[PDB]
Design a protein around this motif. Sequence first.
Motif, mmCIF file in Angstrom:
data_model
loop_
_atom_site.group_PDB
_atom_site.id
_atom_site.type_symbol
_atom_site.label_atom_id
_atom_site.label_comp_id
_atom_site.label_asym_id
_atom_site.label_seq_id
_atom_site.Cartn_x
_atom_site.Cartn_y
_atom_site.Cartn_z
ATOM 1 N N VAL A 1 0.831 -1.198 0.000
ATOM 2 C CA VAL A 1 0.000 0.000 0.000
ATOM 3 C C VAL A 1 0.870 1.255 0.000
ATOM 4 O O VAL A 1 2.066 1.181 0.290
ATOM 5 C CB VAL A 1 -0.943 0.035 1.218
ATOM 6 N N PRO A 2 0.271 2.418 -0.318
ATOM 7 C CA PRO A 2 1.049 3.660 -0.411
ATOM 8 C C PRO A 2 1.603 4.125 0.934
ATOM 9 O O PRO A 2 0.933 3.995 1.959
ATOM 10 C CB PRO A 2 0.034 4.677 -0.952
ATOM 11 C CG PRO A 2 -1.111 3.871 -1.471
ATOM 12 C CD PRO A 2 -1.150 2.645 -0.630
ATOM 13 N N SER A 3 2.814 4.669 0.920
ATOM 14 C CA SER A 3 3.444 5.167 2.136
ATOM 15 C C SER A 3 4.560 6.145 1.798
ATOM 16 O O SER A 3 5.079 6.145 0.682
ATOM 17 C CB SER A 3 3.996 4.010 2.968
ATOM 18 O OG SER A 3 5.107 3.409 2.323
ATOM 19 N N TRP A 4 4.931 6.975 2.766
ATOM 20 C CA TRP A 4 5.986 7.954 2.548
ATOM 21 C C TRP A 4 7.354 7.287 2.345
ATOM 22 O O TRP A 4 8.075 7.643 1.412
ATOM 23 C CB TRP A 4 6.034 8.951 3.708
ATOM 24 C CG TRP A 4 4.921 9.956 3.665
ATOM 25 C CD1 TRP A 4 3.925 10.118 4.585
ATOM 26 C CD2 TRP A 4 4.684 10.931 2.642
ATOM 27 N NE1 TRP A 4 3.087 11.137 4.201
ATOM 28 C CE2 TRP A 4 3.531 11.653 3.010
ATOM 29 C CE3 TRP A 4 5.335 11.265 1.451
ATOM 30 C CZ2 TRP A 4 3.018 12.688 2.232
ATOM 31 C CZ3 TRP A 4 4.825 12.291 0.680
ATOM 32 C CH2 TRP A 4 3.678 12.991 1.074
ATOM 33 N N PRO A 5 7.717 6.315 3.206
ATOM 34 C CA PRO A 5 8.979 5.601 2.974
ATOM 35 C C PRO A 5 9.058 4.992 1.575
ATOM 36 O O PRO A 5 10.118 5.003 0.949
ATOM 37 C CB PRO A 5 8.964 4.503 4.041
ATOM 38 C CG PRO A 5 8.116 5.050 5.124
ATOM 39 C CD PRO A 5 7.061 5.868 4.449
ATOM 40 N N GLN A 6 7.932 4.478 1.094
ATOM 41 C CA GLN A 6 7.858 3.880 -0.234
ATOM 42 C C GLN A 6 8.115 4.915 -1.326
ATOM 43 O O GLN A 6 9.033 4.767 -2.133
ATOM 44 C CB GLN A 6 6.490 3.231 -0.443
ATOM 45 C CG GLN A 6 6.303 2.553 -1.792
ATOM 46 C CD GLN A 6 4.845 2.269 -2.089
ATOM 47 O OE1 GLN A 6 4.061 3.185 -2.343
ATOM 48 N NE2 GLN A 6 4.470 0.995 -2.045
ATOM 49 N N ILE A 7 7.292 5.958 -1.345
ATOM 50 C CA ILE A 7 7.359 6.977 -2.388
ATOM 51 C C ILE A 7 8.665 7.770 -2.331
ATOM 52 O O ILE A 7 9.301 7.998 -3.359
ATOM 53 C CB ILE A 7 6.154 7.939 -2.284
ATOM 54 C CG1 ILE A 7 4.869 7.200 -2.675
ATOM 55 C CG2 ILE A 7 6.348 9.160 -3.182
ATOM 56 C CD1 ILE A 7 3.599 7.994 -2.473
ATOM 57 N N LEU A 8 9.054 8.198 -1.134
ATOM 58 C CA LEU A 8 10.291 8.955 -0.959
ATOM 59 C C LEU A 8 11.504 8.120 -1.356
ATOM 60 O O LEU A 8 12.417 8.613 -2.019
ATOM 61 C CB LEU A 8 10.430 9.428 0.489
ATOM 62 C CG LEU A 8 9.359 10.403 0.994
ATOM 63 C CD1 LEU A 8 9.573 10.708 2.471
ATOM 64 C CD2 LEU A 8 9.355 11.689 0.181
ATOM 65 N N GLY A 9 11.505 6.852 -0.953
ATOM 66 C CA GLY A 9 12.583 5.942 -1.297
ATOM 67 C C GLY A 9 12.702 5.738 -2.795
ATOM 68 O O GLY A 9 13.800 5.616 -3.332
ATOM 69 N N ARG A 10 11.559 5.700 -3.471
ATOM 70 C CA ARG A 10 11.527 5.537 -4.918
ATOM 71 C C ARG A 10 12.065 6.785 -5.616
ATOM 72 O O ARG A 10 12.721 6.694 -6.653
ATOM 73 C CB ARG A 10 10.100 5.234 -5.378
ATOM 74 C CG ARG A 10 9.962 4.922 -6.855
ATOM 75 C CD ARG A 10 8.612 4.302 -7.144
ATOM 76 N NE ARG A 10 8.454 3.969 -8.558
ATOM 77 C CZ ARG A 10 7.657 3.012 -9.027
ATOM 78 N NH1 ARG A 10 6.935 2.263 -8.200
ATOM 79 N NH2 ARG A 10 7.587 2.794 -10.332
ATOM 80 N N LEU A 11 11.795 7.952 -5.036
ATOM 81 C CA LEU A 11 12.278 9.209 -5.597
ATOM 82 C C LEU A 11 13.780 9.376 -5.377
ATOM 83 O O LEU A 11 14.488 9.861 -6.258
ATOM 84 C CB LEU A 11 11.523 10.396 -4.989
ATOM 85 C CG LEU A 11 10.078 10.596 -5.460
ATOM 86 C CD1 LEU A 11 9.370 11.626 -4.591
ATOM 87 C CD2 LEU A 11 10.032 11.017 -6.923
#
Lengths: 343, 343
Positions: A1-11
Amino acid sequence: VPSWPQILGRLTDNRDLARGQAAWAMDQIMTGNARPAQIAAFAVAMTMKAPTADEVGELAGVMLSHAHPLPADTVPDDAVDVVGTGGDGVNTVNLSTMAAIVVAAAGVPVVKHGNRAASSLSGGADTLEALGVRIDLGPDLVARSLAEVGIGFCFAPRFHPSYRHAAAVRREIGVPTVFNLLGPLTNPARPRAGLIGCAFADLAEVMAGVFAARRSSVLVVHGDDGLDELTTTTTSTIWRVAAGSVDKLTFDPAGFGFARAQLDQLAGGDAQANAAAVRAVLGGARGPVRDAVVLNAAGAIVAHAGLSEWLPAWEEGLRRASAAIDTGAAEQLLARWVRFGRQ
Amino acid sequence: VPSWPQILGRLTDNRDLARGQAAWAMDQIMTGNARPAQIAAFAVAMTMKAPTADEVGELAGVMLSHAHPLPADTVPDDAVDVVGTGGDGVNTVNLSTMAAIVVAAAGVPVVKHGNRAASSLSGGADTLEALGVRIDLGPDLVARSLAEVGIGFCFAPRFHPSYRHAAAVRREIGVPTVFNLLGPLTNPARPRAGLIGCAFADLAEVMAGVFAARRSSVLVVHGDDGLDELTTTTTSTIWRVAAGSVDKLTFDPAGFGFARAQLDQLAGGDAQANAAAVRAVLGGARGPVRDAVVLNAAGAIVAHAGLSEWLPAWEEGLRRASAAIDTGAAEQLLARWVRFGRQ
Ligand SMILES: O=P(O)(O)OC[C@H]1O[C@H](OP(=O)(O)OP(=O)(O)O)[C@H](O)[C@@H]1O
Ligand SMILES: O=P(O)(O)OC[C@H]1O[C@H](OP(=O)(O)OP(=O)(O)O)[C@H](O)[C@@H]1O
Ligand SMILES: [Mg+2]
Ligand SMILES: [Mg+2]
């Protein structure tokens, strides 16, 4: 599911986000659910990664989904906007605001998005305010202004209240980010045409891509002297958005009889000084400022024409813009605009 | 004229900072003079730009200049650390902590710097706490521990109180940043030697450069399976630091008679599970876990030697590590360590 660690890590891994992720992030931000540290991390990471039109599109989509809309059937189909990202760091007069008045006076409906200064001595809202124009009007009164005067002004804080947490973070970190692109991309009245200035050359193409996706008729302009306006001191790079496709051009006012100006000739001051500069131009004063205003006003009219050729469009735009001033129509429109908000 | 807009702008433009700029930034952060948004913007920007040895060296220097020191002449000149960045993603047993105890029992002074877990079930401090070791001691008592037991533990919150602002933001954004490199570089006792684990293969060389500037004798290790430890499952990459020069090496435990293990054999659990794994090794239990601890313990002993060959140093380190366990010296040391904190 969506999360800040996920999205930020991907960026931070320098990867484009998956469809929907940028939207989730902005929605968290736009619902008071994000920590300032998370807001700041996302804004910076997005910027340094290199944002795509799709990602910035999702950000703008979320903002517009949360924003106060104008009532049904109050914004003409051929309405135009004239606004920039700001932040070129050059203390000029308010060219977009002045051009918008002239365009409205030429008979082209204008619903302008705008805001106060961020890093300049006086933004569009500040200068309009100094002229006696009501900037903080709500959806219904902006609609009335547009119908009765030919122009209305949407104050971004007024129509985007839940952006206040993101706006605060922008102020704290100072450095430009992807957020700086969102103002011009989130006009709550959603006009389909516009002259849109971008202070950041590397990101002008991305802004154009967002507009293309909406199949808007927009000229995304970047003065090659750095201005987020069509400049008169040198050439300007234009990303022409039409038929859902972007087209990069270099524009030279010299090809239309405009003399090269110096940047100090376009310099302005505080809200009062810049308001005096507006009255000067609308009063028929010829010179560098008038030229810059006429050129920008014409560009907006060309964008308006694009809703339905390049050289004849600019010639008509320049004709109508100059005529709007010389007849006194532009001067009268501002007075009628000032009177509207007082009544 | 140092400022956040200035430094953040320099980083977002993908430029290395000037001398003193990283130091200014960290000192602002270490004095409660930085907004969370500013801290987060800085941490992310530094990571995505790719931090240099100089820059990371400045951040660590600020932290150590604000840290609680140990009393004068309480830390031996040849004390070692065994510590890693963490964040290898793999929930393993506490290898560094186990090696540290064995290394201490072998007669090499150990002043351990560490912390609780970030993304693991149990970190070194959690496991030590579950073993009955007192972790939250002040400088005076760490000095006594290092003198009477042969080992001491510096709890980072205790010695780096001014880091709490940076710590909070790290936990809010979750994503790893340059901050994740600072733990191993900011031991308050400032040991000149150690076995340093880096979970990030592309930042290990940076860490080695920082130690090299300090004329420290360290082995910065990255398990080619991702571990911030010397692994037995496969080869490891070692940045060997001695005489202010870094040498990159591929390390094969099979060259010392170690059977290839599986990463799940080194897997761990909560504090209670990991504590029991410590007792098992120190009790003389043969197996994959013992092989990993002996290997890491040997590496720290090799780094210790570097303060004053390669294979003969490793052979001796392996002998001393093994004997320290087999004689019961490592088991006894832990017992005496627990005893000290209660007496
Ligand atoms: O302080 P800055 O960050 O540098 O931005 C200056 C102004 O430009 C933008 O609008 P607009 O294009 O309408 O202003 P303008 O009339 O001066 O061109 C922005 O909303 C500001 O009002
Ligand atoms: O939660 P993580 O981010 O995944 O890190 C796990 C632990 O590793 C580090 O300590 P250290 O290497 O010195 O001890 P350890 O390897 O035995 O756990 C870190 O301080 C943590 O305590
Ligand atoms: Mg403008
Ligand atoms: Mg470790």
